[PDB]
């Protein structure tokens, strides 16, 4: 398990960050913690100032899936911080991506074996984060597979997305505006 489309220094720098945060939340340098404990501490540390703590708990709990998994480890934090940039703007990247998913078919899945149940279908559209390369989002579409990477070290204010050609994108919004994966409205100007 390691973030991809990253240089060795980036990979090293990311890992050190996860170690720092895992200790700051659980008081341990490794081991395991009770699921509820992690979700609560992460919620208080990652949520926005105006965002209710209960709201952050439901969003993190939903992403941090397995639900029925009593405990969690640093590998889950690694995986979770790899998906949504730095913790500084983690709730912003979550909102950006989930919004697009919720409006284009609810194709984003966070449960494991999402890659196994994805090929069982065919003329559908699913997307998940590679369990081995957590910062890599895989889009399975009728036409073919697409890969787009999240830059765990870059805040939402920056160009935190990059493709295989090294091209950078301002955000999930701008990215799906370039590579589109309807609903008009009564405008009384």
TrEMBL record:
GO terms for molecular function: metal ion binding. The keyword Zinc applies. It comes from the Eukaryota. Transmembrane segments: none annotated. Keywords: Metal-binding, Zinc. The keyword Zinc applies. Residues 1-178 form the Initiator binding protein 39kDa C-terminal domain. This is 39 kDa initiator binding protein.
């Amino acid at each position: 398990m390691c973030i991809g489309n990253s240089t060795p220094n980036e990979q090293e720098t990311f890992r050190a960050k996860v170690d720092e945060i895992w200790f700051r939340l659980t008081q341990k340098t490794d081991g395991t913690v009770m699921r509820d404990f992690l979700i609560e501490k992460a919620a208080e540390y990652f949520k926005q100032p105006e965002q209710p703590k209960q709201n952050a708990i439901e969003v993190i709990s939903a992403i941090m899936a397995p639900q029925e998994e009593q405990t969690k480890s640093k590998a889950d934090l690694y995986k979770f911080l790899a998906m949504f940039g730095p913790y500084e703007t983690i709730m912003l990247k979550i909102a950006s991506l989930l919004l697009i998913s919720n409006n284009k078919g609810h194709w984003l899945t966070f449960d494991p074996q999402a890659e196994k149940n994805a090929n069982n279908q065919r003329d559908s559209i699913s997307g998940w984060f590679d369990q081995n390369e957590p910062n890599c989002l895989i889009l399975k579409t009728p036409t073919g597979i697409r890969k787009i990477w999240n830059k765990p070290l870059i805040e939402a204010t920056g160009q935190y997305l990059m493709d295989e050609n090294g091209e950078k994108y301002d955000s999930w919004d701008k990215y799906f505006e370039m590579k589109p994966i309807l609903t008009a409205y009564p405008t009384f100007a």
